A paper describes a structure:
Phosphoglucomutase (EC 5.4.2.2., PGM), a key enzyme of glycogenolysis and glycogenesis, catalyzes the interconversion of glucose 1-phosphate and glucose 6-phosphate, whereas phosphomannomutase (EC 5.4.2.8., PMM) transfers the phosphate group from the 1′ to the 6′, or from the 6′ to the 1′ position in mannose phosphate. However, in the hyperthermophilic archaeon [name], a single gene, [name], encodes a protein with both PGM and PMM activities. Moreover, thermostability studies confirmed a half-life of 85 min at 100 °C.
The map of PGMTk was determined at a nominal resolution of 2.45 Å with D2 symmetry, as shown by the GSFSC plot (FSC = 0.143). The tetrameric structure of PGMTk is constituted of two dimers arranged in D2 symmetry. Alignment of 453 residues of chain A to those of chains B, C, and D using GESAMT resulted in root mean square deviation (RMSD) values of 0.18, 0.18, and 0.17 Å, respectively. The first three domains adopt a three-layer α/β/α sandwich architecture, whereas domain IV or the C-terminal domain form a two-layer α/β sandwich topology. In PGMTk, the N- and C-terminal regions adopt a compact, nearly perpendicular orientation, with an interdomain angle of 95.7°. The N-terminal domain was found to have lower B-factors and showed a rigid symmetry, while the flexible C-terminal region had comparatively larger B-factors. The alignment of PGMTk structures predicted by AlphaFold2 and experimentally obtained using cryo-EM showed an RMSD of only 0.41 Å.
Author numbering:
A (entry chain C), D (entry chain D): 3 to 453
B (entry chain B), C (entry chain A): 3 to 454
């Protein structure tokens, strides 16, 4: 009702008002106080968005009224705030951000004591407190205290200690950074410089108006950035979103690298350095990740679509590496969430150690072809998905029903999953050949039209 | 309904909740935006109270949502925040404080562009916006910006440039300052040190829990401070409240000096250095201030009870000096509000230039005797006061009805005024002699009982 | 001896040691105190260089020991620090920067109360105090206080109030910014966004290691930036140095625009808006500036080579616009020094109002051809320049000897000037045609060889 | 030569110039770098003295030039800066303070990685580097970074966790605090309030001009403060010096309590709660501390006069409690140095748990009478002290020569020791009776005149 997949989000000063942020902070503080903790500690941060400071002030005022001490870490990436929540041994965390949404949007993400996003069980309690307003109001002497900490340099140093800095310094990669005027404008260029790379940063000045483009790093938005990467003659380019929790890589030829391929590279390196392990992923990801685990003697766990679900599965099952179809890699031993800067550091280390070119590393992975479409259908799309699953079952097709209808074929698969946010039923198909991937794609639409 | 005489007050986290502060900030920003200004600038400060930071955060978040730029001056005295509001050319000001109230209380005071407390018409507009919640919500690109400034040192320098520092340094008074862990713990001891005094400070560490006593500097609360002043052998002692907008002085003998006498000293010095002027005050203020103006060739304007009314009359009539019966002196040229530190600096300058002792300076003023009493009467207190006025009129008594019933005599007066906050009708009496002061007090009680 | 053309510079921690910065601060404070001021106020800033904070700390410690109050403005452009020195009514200013030098360099620039670089008369006293160490050591109670201020937003707002923001917002230019990880990474992209432009900034994160390139924005260094400007399809691109006192512009086609042409555009706009005035320049600049002033009914004053000389001439003669051959434009009404951000804002306003393309605006100026060469000559280069002047005088050539030997021809000139630092004698030639410009260049080389 | 017993002090801007502080910082950084550490971390703090900011700036600039990272903790007590040096795992520490010296003085104290004052072996190297100026100058890219931390609240919380807060809250003592406008104006009044006391603070506003009095809390300086304690009717009053490393206590009757008696109370409580231990002290300390250890089954180690020697002996021999004749108590497990705030907290806890009055607690200790006199004698006073020792040896008197000449009697002792700072030979005498204290005192003067 209130929170989406990860946090609540909306238009700033229209839906996410200071009253809304204050009530969210009061509900979170009430949840923390009604759990045994007598003086809960909360780490609060925000991205560069212009409405963040007002929303952060309202949230902190709400948290202090409940008797919770608040650590204000200022502007920092969402993975950095998640890391600081565990670093400070806080009882919770809050991020004022809207991820990749346009500048007019903002939102709040509530975190666990370990930095992972808030559990749905606790999110239900937060929603109940928000709508009932049964807030805990601390006495005048029990009102929490606010102190400010800087977490950018400690977080960069924490990332720097998890990679082979000497190899990067020996190679000295030439990396172009596109932080998109987001929270990554304070971490990624400096982290890459300390790794030992030659850094040319694009839109690396923190600006909540996002003068260049929307903070979503997709191919259409990164058309110009790919041209910059081509022109500068760089080894590769990396682009981040507003909260710097995602990293998108561009090769030396200005080609948009899909997130699944960079996730495959990172997972291959991590599993090889771990001698196997567990690879937690979603059901919408490529079979390229399955082959990576097979070549490394590791098991693959396919969860539902969602970064929070992947992080929960990694924590519960002691996973080694995690990621989603968008290519947001999760390093459980570092941060229980997507970390664009850690992914970039790992990719840089892989590039330095390999001795090959970035496009050579990407192309050396097993080849898969994917096609996507989104039929706009209104109504109970879950029933339609179930009916498509039944129709595929009658035709003898092997199917999986974890999140949607995934028809498990021999050389590939076709996935029929309906997004809950909007009345659209997306169809995902993939195979080892161009024709077969489209062949499975038409079958997905064929069954959908039957239902 | 919402605001009192000067700002709204209540128990922190019970009545003055973060929602309340946020709504107050949104209403104030809406008032500022609806008055033509496109990017209003607001100076926001608070006292040392523990609940201040949460309330200040809520208020600032509310102000930024309306499109107003906010200057956060941190912890500072209320007169310092008013001076900063005038100094930064801000379109308004806000103080998170409860003045002298116990530690569990907090409140918000809204200020004018010149630092004076908000006008009653604009306060009514703010109340209407608060209760209707018809707030102006700025777009994402029009959200206000917040910046932090330090005003303690500029405020001290501004006070320091208004007195004869050389005379104070020559005299080097020994002053004991009790800031009561309030916002004055950051200004008054340092200001006194820079004036050239030997400073021994009591409770000068800023603590919002007020471990020593309640921040109200009355004689009962200052019993220990008077003992400290006597023991240390100091020239005089000065005590301030939580927001440091009031100053209470103790002589070298440990005697609680009434605020009217210190106001009389300050007004005498100011009028003498001004060659006369206008002395705006209340109707409860002693005749000691009238004689001060007579000796200085100055006129006296007696307004209703309240420091905001005195400041308004000083601004409108271009007054020279202002004050109330409580002794809160207002310096119109410096700040359009009560300023404890400016009053302390002026008193220190007077003491240094006089060459006498503090008790000698206080006793050289004309002697008046005052008595106070209160009756907890529940009813139409305004009608009772009017009936007392009519009864006094029937008996031939000269009466003034500016605020309550004030019977004027040749040597003194008796005032029958009903408090507007609690069901109590207070009787104020004064005369040039001990016996006559009680005689007027008994007459006031006698007339009150006749009306009752 | 110690100071060069504008400030002292050297390798950090080898020549510009913390001892050197401390001695410089003590000498500057001694100069300020020995000039009558009882508590001088100094505005101290630095660029993004990694050695700046240690040098700034040493300089401030030296300044405080002399009894001078210090305002620390943090990392800011040199023009911003000059603007803050004038804005805070400071008695002096200091900038910890090496301008465009490689990352291993640093230095100190001392400023006047109005923000202009320190006069040579006062620089001689500073050098004498530095070498004699006859510093004024304030007493324990007279040691200056340190204060921190943020000047980025006030400086940006000051630049905004000097251009037609509405026209820029209507046009919405697409500008690519190269701040080169310098002090301009905090001002120029934000200023351009507030003007109303679409801003894509490269190397806009402040980093003192300069990972991309050396902070000098020349064509060889800006080869990649030109490709970025071409690829992005932007209206034009602007590049700044480490201290953000210079601005280099690239047109929509990725062509390196010479600083003289952008200075000509800015001067044309300023003189047209001013209805004439005085154009202060150096003798090494193009005749393009003479035609610009002639078309605007303005006078041209040609000073010696050096930005400090141009600023001094602008201040003394009440000039309207100033600049040098490198294209660093000086706006006397705003800042008495080169300002990259003000120049960028003026250029953006010109582009928005013109309605044409940047290359069209550049090409509409009168066309001149310039050729440059240098000869590494070891000897009395001043005597050789004088001998070249005499040889040209014997041949009937009109010559000006303001700074070097400038042979004033009909359609152009050839300049023979010897660099003070390097043992080289540069030859500058200009004319209205390619062949004739080279013809004048050969004559300059011919005369130099004859003297040699 | 340069450093005294603990640090170097002098008149600010005359002897302790910014050049002197810069050279000290450079020498300390050179010592840290020449000891194998690649990026040493230094915690730098100062007291409220007006000359401390420029001196701190010069010292930090010197430290950064050597390649050492600096944590600037601002204004804090010297024990707080030592605690932060140990807390941040710093490789060293520096305090800009002159302790109890008049306002015109300032100085620098260098600290060990554990917060204890710098060893004499390392102080010699620092002196050699200072005078030879053979400083290590880091490259442009190796220059250290500076960051600021607030240590007041963490230090107060650390002190709170070491005492029984509940007993103090139950008792609610009424304590008068005299911080003398020093660095203790930021910690002690707040610490005592969080303990649960009613706090009336005197001169608790931090001012480097010291408008009230010199920051030395002696009886002549505290004459007015004793009157304040009497007038307010408080349980007891505690006074601190400028750096807040010493605490002087005044009972409810306004009587100046000697530091030895408060040290005896604290040591008794600590040893009782420890079941015995080692009581490290000086040879000038009263026998009152010996009886305290005897009653608690603890041993006494008597070192030479000086707080640094006491701290060194506490660290090397794993001592339990330490202190000197002045009464500066050292808690080895908390801070390897004098801590006025920890001593005040322990005294408050003892007072709360005792149920008696402060004068009753002080008077319950065994009674000793002490007399102090000095003779201004020039020349080699060490030879004179040795000759007095020989004369006492000839007369059959038992003598100890750990520091000066201490004649060990049965009910008391007389000590003949000359301070090296000034040409004065002090005579310390003590006995269990008033008459014998003077009787031993005259014997000390008698033997001194014989030499």
């Amino acid at each position: 009702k209130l929170f989406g997949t990860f946090g609540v989000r909306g238009i700033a000063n229209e839906e996410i008002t200071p009253e809304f942020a204050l009530k969210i902070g009061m509900a979170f503080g009430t949840l923390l106080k009604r759990e045994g903790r007598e003086r809960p500690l909360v780490v609060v941060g925000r991205d560069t968005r212009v409405s963040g400071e007002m929303l952060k002030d309202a949230l902190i005022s709400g948290l202090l009224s409940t008797g919770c001490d608040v650590i204000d870490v200022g502007i920092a990436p969402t993975p950095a705030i998640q890391w600081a929540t565990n670093h400070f041994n806080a009882d919770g965390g809050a991020v004022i951000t809207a991820s990749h949404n346009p500048p007019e949007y903002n939102g709040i993400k509530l975190l666990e004591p370990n930095g992972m996003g808030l559990k749905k069980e606790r999110e239900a309690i937060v929603e109940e407190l928000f709508f009932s307003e049964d807030f805990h109001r601390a006495k005048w002497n029990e009102i929490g205290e606010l102190r400010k900490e800087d977490i950018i340099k400690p977080y960069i140093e924490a990332i720097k200690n998890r990679v082979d800095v000497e190899a990067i310094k020996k190679r000295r990669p030439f990396v172009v950074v596109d932080t998109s005027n987001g929270a990554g404008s304070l971490t990624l260029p400096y982290l890459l410089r300390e790794l030992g790379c030659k850094v040319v940063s694009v839109n690396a000045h923190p600006d909540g108006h996002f003068p260049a483009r929307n903070p979503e790093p997709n191919e259409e938005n990164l058309k110009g950035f790919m041209e910059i990467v081509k022109a500068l003659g760089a080894d590769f380019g990396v682009a981040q979103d507003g909260d710097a929790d995602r990293a998108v890589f561009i090769d030396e030829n200005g080609r948009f690298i899909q997130g699944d391929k960079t996730f495959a590279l990172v997972a291959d390196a991590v599993l090889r350095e771990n001698g196997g392990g567990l690879l937690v992923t979603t059901i919408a990801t490529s079979n390229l990740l399955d082959d990576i685990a097979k070549r490394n003697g590791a098991k693959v766990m396919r969860t539902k679509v969602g970064d929070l679900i992947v992080a929960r599965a990694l924590l519960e099952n002691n996973g080694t590496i995690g990621g989603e179809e968008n290519g947001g890699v999760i390093f459980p031993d570092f941060v229980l969430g997507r970390d664009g800067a850690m992914t970039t550091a790992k990719i840089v280390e892989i590039f330095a150690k390999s001795g090959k070119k970035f496009s050579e590393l990407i192309d050396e992975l097993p080849k898969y072809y994917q096609f996507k479409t989104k039929r706009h259908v209104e109504g109970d799309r879950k029933a339609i998905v179930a009916k498509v699953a039944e129709l595929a079952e009658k035709k003898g097709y092997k199917i999986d029903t974890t999140d949607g209808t995934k028809i498990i074929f021999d050389d590939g698969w076709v996935l029929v999953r309906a997004s809950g946010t909007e009345p659209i039923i997306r169809i995902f198909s993939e195979a080892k050949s161009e024709e077969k991937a489209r062949e499975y794609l038409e079958l997905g639409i064929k069954l959908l039209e039957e239902a």
